[PDB]
Amino acid sequence: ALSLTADQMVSALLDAEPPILYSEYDPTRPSMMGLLTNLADRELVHMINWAKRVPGFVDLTLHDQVHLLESAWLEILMIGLVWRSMEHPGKLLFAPNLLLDRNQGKMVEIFDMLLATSSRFRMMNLQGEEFVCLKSIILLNSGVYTFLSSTLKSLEEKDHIHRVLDKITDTLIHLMAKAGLTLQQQHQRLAQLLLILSHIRHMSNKGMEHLYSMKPLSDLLLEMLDAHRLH
Amino acid sequence: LALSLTADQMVSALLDAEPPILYSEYDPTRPFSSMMGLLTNLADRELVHMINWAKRVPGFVDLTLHDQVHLLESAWLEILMIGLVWRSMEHPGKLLFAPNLLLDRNQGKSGMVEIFDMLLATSSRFRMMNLQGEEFVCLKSIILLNSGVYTFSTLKSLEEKDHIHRVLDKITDTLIHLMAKAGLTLQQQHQRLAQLLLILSHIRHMSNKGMEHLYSMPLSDLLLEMLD
Ligand SMILES: C[C@@H]1CCCN1CCOc1ccc([C@@H]2c3ccc(O)cc3CC[C@@H]2c2ccccc2)cc1
Ligand SMILES: C[C@@H]1CCCN1CCOc1ccc([C@@H]2c3ccc(O)cc3CC[C@@H]2c2ccccc2)cc1
């Protein structure tokens, strides 16, 4: 796991990818928040499956897996959405049957921020292999500064998370080296990619403000993560 | 000529631009309590020096005043926060708001303690990484340039965004150069670059939480007056 090569890391992440789900409406019939909520809830189940396949994640305690997904889940939905939307300028591909433009989004604020991210991804010509690295970084990084714990186990947990994050950095650099970029270009693109994650955090916080405005997730996460081996 | 700077010239430029460390203004001969009031007054005085600082970050005054305002509107609380975390770095468990205002997390209990704890953790993480002064000024400049650059489509705006990203690239070059100079291997350089940049997502998170607090009880006009 920390023993994986760059190519094995990339292969593992690509293999872990969740499916693209559909909105649940009658397409024969003639609302929006309900559709998005239902989609997101279904997507969360698959997200837990994906998370367990990110190298290193199931090495963590269940408490820490819950903490990381509780921190990162909306970021992860958002980056998935932005990736799906990357070749549909001005629109957001929530699902193959739910492609919305900004007028249909009317918070249109969240909507515009997501569109700009998709644009930035298009500008950078983000690759699939880069995307899955970034999404795994979100999963490992977003909650790693907010463990409210300094037990010896917590120190070990945090060290492991940072070692896995380091392996993903190595993997990104390797992908860029393989694509012919100079060392200078390599560190510049690495930086460009990681700085977008700040914007994605911003978007998640804005979205969370919207959802909390609608009146514990940790219990659901724990239920889905704390699986038995009876299958 | 900002894009023509060497890494060493970029670093000297940034170190030279650093704002002063301000004091809280209260009567120290008087009994202690007024916390938000003290922190607000401090933050407001610190904002004026921030504008001065930003105009000295290579490349920033090449931008339109509209875009300078937009970048500082996005980033100002992040910038106050990374400043605080930096001067708190050698004070485990406390936050050095000012040399005469050093607070532990219990004193922050007077929705604040949540923000206090996140800031303390960032100071811890800086301690663990042994963040250097030259790295810190690079990171703070990156916040200034990056935080608002996804939320500005005119020809001018395309040109502005390209310039911002080119300056950000030069600061990335500069970080890597600092790390190479400190004797780190190429692998260690890229790993440390990534570790430093990923802390910026947490600082963004902290800013949004803090903004929720401040709005709970327009700035661009004040920024414009100060920048113009
Ligand atoms: C999944 C969450 C966790 C438990 C309860 N459930 C509440 C609903 O959460 C959401 C999350 C995202 C959305 C929208 C969405 C849907 C699917 C997806 O792949 C991407 C996104 C991105 C954000 C979007 C949204 C978020 C907040 C406010 C409006 C829209 C809507 C509701
Ligand atoms: C400066 C701004 C812009 C216009 C009005 N003015 C109000 C913002 O006020 C604050 C008040 C407190 C802070 C606290 C602080 C003070 C000084 C400084 O160097 C660092 C910080 C870190 C954040 C901190 C804060 C922010 C929100 C809630 C509680 C504490 C930051 C900004």
Short mmCIF file of C-alpha atoms and ligand atoms in Angstrom, two decimals:
data_model
loop_
_atom_site.label_atom_id
_atom_site.label_comp_id
_atom_site.label_asym_id
_atom_site.label_seq_id
_atom_site.Cartn_x
_atom_site.Cartn_y
_atom_site.Cartn_z
CA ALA A 1 0.00 0.00 0.00
CA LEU A 2 2.80 2.37 0.89
CA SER A 3 4.63 -0.27 -1.20
CA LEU A 4 2.64 0.48 -4.37
CA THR A 5 4.40 1.82 -7.44
CA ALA A 6 3.05 4.93 -9.18
CA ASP A 7 1.52 2.83 -11.98
CA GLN A 8 -0.07 0.50 -9.39
CA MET A 9 -1.46 3.48 -7.50
CA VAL A 10 -3.05 4.84 -10.72
CA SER A 11 -4.39 1.43 -11.71
CA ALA A 12 -5.89 0.97 -8.23
CA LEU A 13 -7.63 4.38 -8.32
CA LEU A 14 -9.02 3.94 -11.83
CA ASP A 15 -10.34 0.52 -10.88
CA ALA A 16 -12.02 2.03 -7.78
CA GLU A 17 -14.06 4.56 -9.72
CA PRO A 18 -17.77 4.76 -8.83
CA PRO A 19 -20.40 4.50 -11.51
CA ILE A 20 -22.25 7.40 -13.02
CA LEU A 21 -25.80 7.34 -11.57
CA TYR A 22 -29.05 8.64 -13.06
CA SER A 23 -31.57 11.05 -11.65
CA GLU A 24 -34.79 9.38 -10.59
CA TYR A 25 -37.55 11.13 -12.45
CA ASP A 26 -40.20 10.03 -14.95
CA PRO A 27 -38.72 11.19 -18.27
CA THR A 28 -42.11 10.82 -19.92
CA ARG A 29 -43.57 13.37 -17.47
CA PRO A 30 -43.01 17.12 -17.17
CA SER A 31 -38.54 19.45 -7.86
CA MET A 32 -34.91 20.36 -8.56
CA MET A 33 -33.53 20.21 -5.03
CA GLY A 34 -35.43 16.94 -4.47
CA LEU A 35 -33.86 15.46 -7.61
CA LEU A 36 -30.35 16.57 -6.58
CA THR A 37 -30.75 15.36 -3.01
CA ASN A 38 -31.94 11.90 -4.09
CA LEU A 39 -29.04 11.63 -6.58
CA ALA A 40 -26.52 12.74 -3.95
CA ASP A 41 -27.83 10.29 -1.35
CA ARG A 42 -27.55 7.39 -3.78
CA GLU A 43 -24.08 8.56 -4.81
CA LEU A 44 -22.95 8.51 -1.18
CA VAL A 45 -23.37 4.75 -0.87
CA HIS A 46 -21.09 4.19 -3.83
CA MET A 47 -18.69 6.79 -2.43
CA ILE A 48 -18.14 4.62 0.66
CA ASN A 49 -17.33 1.67 -1.58
CA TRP A 50 -14.91 3.79 -3.53
CA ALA A 51 -13.29 5.13 -0.38
CA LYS A 52 -12.58 1.60 0.89
CA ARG A 53 -10.68 0.97 -2.38
CA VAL A 54 -8.41 4.05 -2.08
CA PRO A 55 -5.06 2.49 -1.07
CA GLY A 56 -4.44 3.07 2.61
CA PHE A 57 -7.96 4.17 3.60
CA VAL A 58 -9.07 0.90 5.24
CA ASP A 59 -5.81 0.84 7.21
CA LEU A 60 -7.30 3.67 9.32
CA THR A 61 -9.64 3.16 12.30
CA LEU A 62 -13.37 3.23 11.50
CA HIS A 63 -13.59 6.39 13.62
CA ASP A 64 -11.03 8.09 11.41
CA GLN A 65 -12.61 6.78 8.15
CA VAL A 66 -15.89 8.35 9.32
CA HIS A 67 -14.11 11.60 10.20
CA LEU A 68 -12.44 11.84 6.79
CA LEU A 69 -15.61 11.12 4.82
CA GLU A 70 -17.64 13.46 7.03
CA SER A 71 -15.15 16.23 6.16
CA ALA A 72 -14.82 15.43 2.46
CA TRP A 73 -18.08 13.98 1.09
CA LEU A 74 -19.51 17.15 -0.47
CA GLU A 75 -16.11 18.08 -1.95
CA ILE A 76 -15.96 14.61 -3.45
CA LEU A 77 -19.47 14.90 -4.97
CA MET A 78 -18.52 18.30 -6.31
CA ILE A 79 -15.25 17.31 -7.94
CA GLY A 80 -17.04 14.32 -9.56
CA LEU A 81 -19.69 16.68 -10.90
CA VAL A 82 -17.11 19.15 -12.23
CA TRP A 83 -15.26 16.27 -14.01
CA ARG A 84 -18.52 15.00 -15.58
CA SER A 85 -19.28 18.55 -16.73
CA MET A 86 -15.83 19.21 -18.20
CA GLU A 87 -16.91 18.85 -21.86
CA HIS A 88 -20.26 20.60 -21.47
CA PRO A 89 -19.37 24.29 -21.22
CA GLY A 90 -21.92 26.39 -19.33
CA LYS A 91 -23.74 23.33 -18.02
CA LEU A 92 -23.56 20.94 -15.12
CA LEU A 93 -23.99 17.21 -15.79
CA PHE A 94 -25.53 16.13 -12.51
CA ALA A 95 -26.49 12.92 -14.30
CA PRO A 96 -26.66 11.79 -17.95
CA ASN A 97 -30.39 12.66 -17.75
CA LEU A 98 -30.04 15.81 -15.70
CA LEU A 99 -27.95 18.41 -17.48
CA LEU A 100 -28.67 21.89 -16.18
CA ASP A 101 -27.52 25.35 -17.23
CA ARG A 102 -27.18 28.26 -14.82
CA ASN A 103 -30.66 29.63 -15.55
CA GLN A 104 -32.07 26.31 -14.42
CA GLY A 105 -30.03 26.58 -11.22
CA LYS A 106 -32.10 29.63 -10.24
CA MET A 107 -28.19 28.58 -5.34
CA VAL A 108 -27.06 29.96 -8.72
CA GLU A 109 -23.99 31.11 -6.71
CA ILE A 110 -22.90 27.48 -6.06
CA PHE A 111 -23.77 26.75 -9.64
CA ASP A 112 -21.50 29.44 -11.06
CA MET A 113 -18.62 28.35 -8.84
CA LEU A 114 -18.95 24.75 -10.09
CA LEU A 115 -19.11 25.95 -13.72
CA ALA A 116 -15.91 27.99 -13.20
CA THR A 117 -14.15 24.91 -11.83
CA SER A 118 -15.19 22.89 -14.84
CA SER A 119 -13.85 25.70 -16.99
CA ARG A 120 -10.53 25.71 -15.13
CA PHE A 121 -10.30 21.92 -15.58
CA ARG A 122 -10.93 22.45 -19.36
CA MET A 123 -8.27 25.18 -19.41
CA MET A 124 -5.76 22.82 -17.79
CA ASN A 125 -6.78 19.84 -19.90
CA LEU A 126 -7.14 17.75 -16.73
CA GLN A 127 -6.53 14.06 -17.40
CA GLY A 128 -8.57 11.14 -15.99
CA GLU A 129 -5.52 9.78 -14.12
CA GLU A 130 -4.92 13.23 -12.58
CA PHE A 131 -8.56 13.54 -11.56
CA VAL A 132 -8.66 10.27 -9.59
CA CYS A 133 -5.42 11.33 -7.79
CA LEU A 134 -7.00 14.68 -6.85
CA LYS A 135 -10.21 13.06 -5.59
CA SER A 136 -8.19 10.67 -3.39
CA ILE A 137 -6.19 13.62 -2.05
CA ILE A 138 -9.45 15.32 -1.05
CA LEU A 139 -10.56 12.18 0.78
CA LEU A 140 -7.28 11.92 2.76
CA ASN A 141 -6.55 15.63 3.31
CA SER A 142 -9.79 17.41 4.03
CA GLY A 143 -10.26 16.07 7.56
CA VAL A 144 -6.64 15.37 8.56
CA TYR A 145 -6.14 18.75 10.33
CA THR A 146 -9.32 18.34 12.41
CA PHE A 147 -8.78 15.10 14.29
CA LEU A 148 -9.60 16.35 17.73
CA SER A 149 -7.16 13.87 19.17
CA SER A 150 -3.56 13.44 20.16
CA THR A 151 -3.57 9.81 21.37
CA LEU A 152 -0.58 7.74 20.22
CA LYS A 153 -2.94 6.02 17.83
CA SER A 154 -3.95 9.41 16.40
CA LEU A 155 -0.32 10.38 15.80
CA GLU A 156 0.18 7.10 13.93
CA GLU A 157 -3.04 7.62 11.96
CA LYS A 158 -2.00 11.12 10.89
CA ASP A 159 1.47 9.94 9.90
CA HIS A 160 0.03 7.17 7.76
CA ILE A 161 -2.41 9.55 6.03
CA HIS A 162 0.42 11.92 5.20
CA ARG A 163 2.59 9.04 3.91
CA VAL A 164 -0.23 7.95 1.59
CA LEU A 165 -0.76 11.57 0.48
CA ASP A 166 2.98 11.67 -0.30
CA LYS A 167 2.61 8.51 -2.43
CA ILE A 168 -0.20 10.21 -4.38
CA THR A 169 2.01 13.31 -4.90
CA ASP A 170 4.74 11.00 -6.28
CA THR A 171 2.14 9.44 -8.51
CA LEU A 172 0.98 12.84 -9.91
CA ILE A 173 4.56 13.84 -10.61
CA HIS A 174 5.12 10.50 -12.35
CA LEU A 175 2.04 10.96 -14.59
CA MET A 176 3.27 14.41 -15.62
CA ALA A 177 6.84 13.16 -16.21
CA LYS A 178 5.43 10.42 -18.42
CA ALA A 179 3.38 13.00 -20.37
CA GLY A 180 6.65 14.79 -21.29
CA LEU A 181 6.48 17.84 -19.04
CA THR A 182 9.76 19.35 -17.89
CA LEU A 183 10.56 19.24 -14.16
CA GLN A 184 9.64 22.92 -13.98
CA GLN A 185 6.30 22.25 -15.68
CA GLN A 186 5.79 19.28 -13.40
CA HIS A 187 5.96 21.21 -10.16
CA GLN A 188 3.98 24.09 -11.68
CA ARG A 189 1.12 21.76 -12.72
CA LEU A 190 1.19 19.97 -9.39
CA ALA A 191 0.75 23.31 -7.71
CA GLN A 192 -1.99 24.43 -10.11
CA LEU A 193 -3.93 21.21 -9.46
CA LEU A 194 -3.62 21.37 -5.68
CA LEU A 195 -4.63 25.03 -5.49
CA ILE A 196 -7.92 24.18 -7.17
CA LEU A 197 -8.71 22.02 -4.11
CA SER A 198 -8.92 25.20 -2.09
CA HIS A 199 -11.66 26.45 -4.31
CA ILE A 200 -13.41 23.07 -4.06
CA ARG A 201 -13.31 23.35 -0.25
CA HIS A 202 -14.77 26.84 -0.54
CA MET A 203 -17.65 25.49 -2.70
CA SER A 204 -18.33 22.68 -0.21
CA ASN A 205 -18.52 25.13 2.67
CA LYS A 206 -20.92 27.28 0.69
CA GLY A 207 -23.03 24.25 -0.20
CA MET A 208 -23.00 23.02 3.41
CA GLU A 209 -24.31 26.42 4.51
CA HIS A 210 -27.17 25.85 2.04
CA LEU A 211 -27.90 22.30 3.29
CA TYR A 212 -27.63 23.08 7.04
CA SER A 213 -30.05 25.94 6.27
CA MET A 214 -32.51 23.11 5.49
CA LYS A 215 -32.37 21.41 8.92
CA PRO A 216 -26.05 12.80 12.48
CA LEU A 217 -24.33 12.04 9.14
CA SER A 218 -21.53 10.42 11.15
CA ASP A 219 -23.99 7.71 12.24
CA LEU A 220 -24.96 6.95 8.63
CA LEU A 221 -21.34 6.95 7.54
CA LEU A 222 -20.43 4.61 10.39
CA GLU A 223 -23.32 2.29 9.47
CA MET A 224 -22.14 2.12 5.85
CA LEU A 225 -18.45 1.88 6.70
CA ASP A 226 -18.75 -0.50 9.74
CA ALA A 227 -19.54 -3.39 7.50
CA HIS A 228 -19.47 -7.02 8.46
CA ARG A 229 -17.73 -9.71 6.33
CA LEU A 230 -20.87 -11.76 5.88
CA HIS A 231 -20.99 -11.24 2.10
CA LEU B 1 8.97 42.95 -14.68
CA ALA B 2 7.43 40.81 -11.91
CA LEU B 3 7.63 37.78 -14.19
CA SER B 4 11.36 38.55 -14.73
CA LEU B 5 12.30 38.06 -11.06
CA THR B 6 14.70 35.34 -10.03
CA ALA B 7 13.65 33.09 -7.13
CA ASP B 8 16.07 34.87 -4.78
CA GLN B 9 14.68 38.25 -5.92
CA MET B 10 11.14 36.99 -5.38
CA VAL B 11 12.03 35.88 -1.80
CA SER B 12 13.79 39.15 -0.90
CA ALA B 13 10.85 41.06 -2.37
CA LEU B 14 8.39 39.13 -0.22
CA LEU B 15 10.46 39.29 2.96
CA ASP B 16 10.86 43.06 2.48
CA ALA B 17 7.08 43.46 2.07
CA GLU B 18 6.22 41.90 5.41
CA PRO B 19 3.72 43.86 7.54
CA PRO B 20 4.50 44.81 11.10
CA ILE B 21 3.30 42.93 14.10
CA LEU B 22 0.61 45.10 15.73
CA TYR B 23 -0.43 45.31 19.38
CA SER B 24 -3.86 44.95 20.86
CA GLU B 25 -5.04 48.25 22.17
CA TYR B 26 -6.25 47.91 25.71
CA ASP B 27 -5.19 49.41 29.02
CA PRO B 28 -2.70 46.85 30.36
CA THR B 29 -2.77 48.46 33.78
CA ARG B 30 -6.53 47.70 33.86
CA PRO B 31 -8.42 44.48 34.70
CA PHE B 32 -8.83 41.94 31.87
CA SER B 33 -12.23 40.70 30.65
CA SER B 34 -14.23 42.44 25.69
CA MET B 35 -12.51 39.74 23.61
CA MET B 36 -14.29 40.11 20.25
CA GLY B 37 -13.89 43.87 20.53
CA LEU B 38 -10.13 43.57 20.98
CA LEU B 39 -9.81 41.05 18.15
CA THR B 40 -11.96 43.17 15.80
CA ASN B 41 -9.95 46.36 16.48
CA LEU B 42 -6.71 44.49 15.91
CA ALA B 43 -7.98 42.91 12.67
CA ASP B 44 -9.20 46.28 11.36
CA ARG B 45 -5.80 47.95 11.97
CA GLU B 46 -4.04 44.93 10.47
CA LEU B 47 -6.15 45.25 7.29
CA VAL B 48 -4.68 48.65 6.45
CA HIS B 49 -1.15 47.21 6.58
CA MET B 50 -2.36 44.27 4.55
CA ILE B 51 -3.23 46.52 1.63
CA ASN B 52 0.26 47.98 1.81
CA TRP B 53 1.72 44.55 1.85
CA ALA B 54 -0.37 43.35 -1.09
CA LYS B 55 0.78 46.23 -3.29
CA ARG B 56 4.35 45.03 -2.71
CA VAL B 57 3.68 41.41 -3.74
CA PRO B 58 5.28 41.22 -7.21
CA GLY B 59 2.63 41.34 -9.90
CA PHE B 60 -0.29 42.43 -7.73
CA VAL B 61 -0.39 46.12 -8.82
CA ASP B 62 -0.20 45.02 -12.46
CA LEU B 63 -3.83 43.95 -12.01
CA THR B 64 -6.84 46.28 -12.36
CA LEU B 65 -8.07 47.92 -9.15
CA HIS B 66 -11.31 45.96 -9.58
CA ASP B 67 -9.34 42.73 -9.58
CA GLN B 68 -7.08 43.79 -6.68
CA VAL B 69 -10.26 44.47 -4.69
CA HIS B 70 -11.71 41.10 -5.69
CA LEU B 71 -8.58 39.19 -4.65
CA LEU B 72 -8.32 40.91 -1.28
CA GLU B 73 -12.07 40.53 -0.64
CA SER B 74 -11.69 36.77 -1.15
CA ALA B 75 -8.46 36.37 0.77
CA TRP B 76 -8.25 38.89 3.62
CA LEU B 77 -9.39 36.61 6.44
CA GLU B 78 -7.21 33.74 5.21
CA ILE B 79 -4.29 36.15 5.22
CA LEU B 80 -5.00 37.34 8.81
CA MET B 81 -5.28 33.71 9.81
CA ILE B 82 -2.05 32.41 8.27
CA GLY B 83 -0.32 35.41 9.88
CA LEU B 84 -1.71 34.48 13.28
CA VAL B 85 -0.79 30.80 12.88
CA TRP B 86 2.79 31.80 11.94
CA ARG B 87 3.33 34.00 14.94
CA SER B 88 1.71 31.33 17.13
CA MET B 89 4.10 28.67 15.82
CA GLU B 90 6.47 28.67 18.84
CA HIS B 91 3.61 28.93 21.36
CA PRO B 92 2.15 25.43 21.64
CA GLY B 93 -1.49 25.54 22.74
CA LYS B 94 -1.90 29.31 22.41
CA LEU B 95 -2.72 31.89 19.81
CA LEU B 96 -0.50 35.01 19.62
CA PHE B 97 -3.04 37.50 18.35
CA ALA B 98 -0.55 40.16 19.39
CA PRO B 99 2.51 40.23 21.66
CA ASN B 100 0.21 41.56 24.40
CA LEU B 101 -2.70 39.29 23.59
CA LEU B 102 -1.75 35.63 23.93
CA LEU B 103 -4.78 33.42 24.40
CA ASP B 104 -5.27 29.71 25.14
CA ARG B 105 -8.32 27.78 23.97
CA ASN B 106 -10.13 28.28 27.29
CA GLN B 107 -9.91 32.06 26.88
CA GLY B 108 -11.46 31.57 23.43
CA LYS B 109 -14.60 30.10 24.99
CA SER B 110 -15.67 33.63 26.02
CA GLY B 111 -18.65 29.62 18.52
CA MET B 112 -15.11 30.91 18.86
CA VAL B 113 -13.39 27.87 20.48
CA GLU B 114 -14.12 25.84 17.27
CA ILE B 115 -12.20 28.39 15.16
CA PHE B 116 -9.49 28.63 17.94
CA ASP B 117 -8.98 24.86 17.82
CA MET B 118 -8.64 24.79 14.05
CA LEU B 119 -6.07 27.64 14.18
CA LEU B 120 -4.11 25.84 16.93
CA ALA B 121 -4.04 22.69 14.79
CA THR B 122 -2.64 24.66 11.86
CA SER B 123 0.07 26.08 14.11
CA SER B 124 0.81 22.48 15.24
CA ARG B 125 1.03 21.34 11.61
CA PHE B 126 3.44 24.22 10.78
CA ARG B 127 5.52 23.20 13.85
CA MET B 128 5.57 19.58 12.67
CA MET B 129 6.69 20.62 9.18
CA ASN B 130 9.23 23.08 10.55
CA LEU B 131 7.85 25.78 8.25
CA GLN B 132 10.47 28.36 7.31
CA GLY B 133 9.98 32.11 7.14
CA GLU B 134 10.78 32.12 3.38
CA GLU B 135 8.17 29.41 2.81
CA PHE B 136 5.59 31.28 4.91
CA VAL B 137 5.82 34.49 2.83
CA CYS B 138 5.50 32.43 -0.39
CA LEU B 139 2.38 30.71 0.97
CA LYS B 140 0.76 33.94 2.10
CA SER B 141 1.30 35.45 -1.37
CA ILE B 142 -0.17 32.37 -2.97
CA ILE B 143 -3.31 32.86 -0.85
CA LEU B 144 -3.56 36.46 -2.03
CA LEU B 145 -3.31 35.49 -5.71
CA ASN B 146 -5.22 32.21 -5.70
CA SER B 147 -8.18 32.56 -3.39
CA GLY B 148 -10.23 34.81 -5.60
CA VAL B 149 -8.94 33.71 -9.06
CA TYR B 150 -11.73 31.17 -9.72
CA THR B 151 -14.51 33.69 -8.93
CA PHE B 152 -13.99 36.64 -11.28
CA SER B 153 -14.99 36.65 -19.19
CA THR B 154 -13.85 39.87 -20.92
CA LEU B 155 -10.62 39.90 -22.91
CA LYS B 156 -9.11 41.90 -20.03
CA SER B 157 -10.27 39.32 -17.50
CA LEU B 158 -8.67 36.51 -19.52
CA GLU B 159 -5.46 38.52 -19.52
CA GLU B 160 -5.74 39.17 -15.79
CA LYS B 161 -6.26 35.49 -15.01
CA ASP B 162 -3.30 34.51 -17.16
CA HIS B 163 -1.05 36.99 -15.41
CA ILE B 164 -2.17 35.79 -11.96
CA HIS B 165 -1.44 32.20 -12.87
CA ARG B 166 1.99 33.13 -14.28
CA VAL B 167 2.87 34.91 -11.03
CA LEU B 168 1.63 31.90 -9.05
CA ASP B 169 3.91 29.75 -11.22
CA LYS B 170 6.88 31.94 -10.38
CA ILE B 171 6.06 31.56 -6.66
CA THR B 172 5.88 27.77 -7.14
CA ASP B 173 9.33 27.95 -8.81
CA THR B 174 10.54 29.96 -5.85
CA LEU B 175 9.26 27.42 -3.24
CA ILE B 176 10.95 24.59 -5.09
CA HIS B 177 14.16 26.63 -5.28
CA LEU B 178 14.09 27.26 -1.52
CA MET B 179 13.63 23.55 -0.92
CA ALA B 180 16.42 22.57 -3.33
CA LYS B 181 18.68 25.02 -1.52
CA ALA B 182 17.84 23.48 1.85
CA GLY B 183 19.22 20.19 0.47
CA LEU B 184 15.99 18.32 -0.10
CA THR B 185 15.88 15.66 -2.79
CA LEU B 186 13.64 16.17 -5.85
CA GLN B 187 11.12 13.70 -4.40
CA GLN B 188 11.16 15.53 -1.06
CA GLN B 189 10.75 18.87 -2.81
CA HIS B 190 7.57 17.84 -4.58
CA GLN B 191 6.22 16.16 -1.48
CA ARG B 192 6.83 19.25 0.63
CA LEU B 193 5.34 21.55 -2.01
CA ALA B 194 2.20 19.43 -1.95
CA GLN B 195 2.06 19.26 1.88
CA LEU B 196 2.33 23.09 2.10
CA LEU B 197 -0.30 23.75 -0.56
CA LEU B 198 -2.77 21.29 1.00
CA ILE B 199 -2.68 23.25 4.25
CA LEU B 200 -4.17 26.16 2.21
CA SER B 201 -7.39 24.19 1.83
CA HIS B 202 -7.67 23.99 5.62
CA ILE B 203 -6.97 27.73 5.88
CA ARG B 204 -9.76 28.35 3.37
CA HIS B 205 -12.02 26.17 5.49
CA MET B 206 -11.14 28.20 8.60
CA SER B 207 -11.85 31.47 6.81
CA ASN B 208 -15.32 30.30 5.74
CA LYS B 209 -16.11 29.22 9.29
CA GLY B 210 -14.88 32.56 10.60
CA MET B 211 -16.84 34.46 7.97
CA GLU B 212 -20.01 32.62 9.02
CA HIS B 213 -19.37 33.97 12.53
CA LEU B 214 -18.70 37.57 11.48
CA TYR B 215 -21.67 37.74 9.08
CA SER B 216 -23.80 36.12 11.82
CA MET B 217 -23.63 39.54 13.49
CA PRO B 218 -19.68 46.75 1.92
CA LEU B 219 -16.06 45.62 2.47
CA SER B 220 -15.24 46.01 -1.21
CA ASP B 221 -15.84 49.78 -0.84
CA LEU B 222 -13.35 50.03 2.00
CA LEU B 223 -10.86 47.93 0.05
CA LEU B 224 -11.26 50.14 -3.02
CA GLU B 225 -10.74 53.32 -0.97
CA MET B 226 -7.61 51.83 0.56
CA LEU B 227 -6.30 50.38 -2.70
CA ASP B 228 -7.15 53.37 -4.99
C1 LIG C 1 -25.82 13.41 0.64
C2 LIG C 1 -26.22 14.28 1.81
C3 LIG C 1 -25.58 13.66 2.99
C4 LIG C 1 -26.66 13.10 3.75
C5 LIG C 1 -27.87 13.87 3.32
N1 LIG C 1 -27.62 14.24 1.96
C6 LIG C 1 -28.20 15.51 1.79
C7 LIG C 1 -28.20 16.07 0.35
O1 LIG C 1 -26.93 16.51 0.00
C8 LIG C 1 -26.78 17.13 -1.29
C9 LIG C 1 -25.41 17.15 -1.92
C10 LIG C 1 -25.15 17.63 -3.14
C11 LIG C 1 -26.28 18.26 -3.91
C12 LIG C 1 -25.92 18.78 -5.26
C13 LIG C 1 -25.13 17.71 -5.90
C14 LIG C 1 -25.85 16.48 -6.30
C15 LIG C 1 -25.17 15.44 -6.82
C16 LIG C 1 -23.81 15.46 -7.12
O2 LIG C 1 -23.13 14.49 -7.77
C17 LIG C 1 -23.21 16.72 -7.01
C18 LIG C 1 -23.87 17.79 -6.22
C19 LIG C 1 -23.04 19.04 -6.01
C20 LIG C 1 -23.70 20.04 -5.13
C21 LIG C 1 -25.20 20.10 -5.24
C22 LIG C 1 -25.75 21.07 -4.22
C23 LIG C 1 -25.22 21.18 -2.99
C24 LIG C 1 -25.76 22.07 -2.10
C25 LIG C 1 -26.80 22.89 -2.45
C26 LIG C 1 -27.34 22.78 -3.69
C27 LIG C 1 -26.79 21.89 -4.56
C28 LIG C 1 -27.51 18.25 -3.37
C29 LIG C 1 -27.78 17.63 -2.00
C1 LIG C 2 -11.17 43.24 9.29
C2 LIG C 2 -12.65 43.11 8.97
C3 LIG C 2 -13.06 43.54 7.64
C4 LIG C 2 -14.07 44.54 7.89
C5 LIG C 2 -14.46 44.44 9.35
N1 LIG C 2 -13.45 43.67 10.01
C6 LIG C 2 -14.06 42.67 10.88
C7 LIG C 2 -13.31 41.25 10.95
O1 LIG C 2 -12.99 41.04 12.14
C8 LIG C 2 -12.19 40.05 12.54
C9 LIG C 2 -12.33 39.92 13.81
C10 LIG C 2 -11.52 38.90 14.50
C11 LIG C 2 -10.62 38.18 13.86
C12 LIG C 2 -9.77 37.23 14.58
C13 LIG C 2 -8.40 37.59 14.21
C14 LIG C 2 -7.93 38.93 14.62
C15 LIG C 2 -6.69 39.29 14.27
C16 LIG C 2 -5.83 38.52 13.50
O2 LIG C 2 -4.53 38.75 13.24
C17 LIG C 2 -6.23 37.21 13.26
C18 LIG C 2 -7.60 36.85 13.51
C19 LIG C 2 -8.00 35.44 13.10
C20 LIG C 2 -9.48 35.27 13.01
C21 LIG C 2 -10.12 35.81 14.26
C22 LIG C 2 -11.59 35.57 14.29
C23 LIG C 2 -12.36 35.66 13.18
C24 LIG C 2 -13.70 35.39 13.30
C25 LIG C 2 -14.24 35.02 14.50
C26 LIG C 2 -13.44 34.94 15.60
C27 LIG C 2 -12.12 35.18 15.48
C28 LIG C 2 -10.43 38.37 12.38
C29 LIG C 2 -11.21 39.26 11.74
#
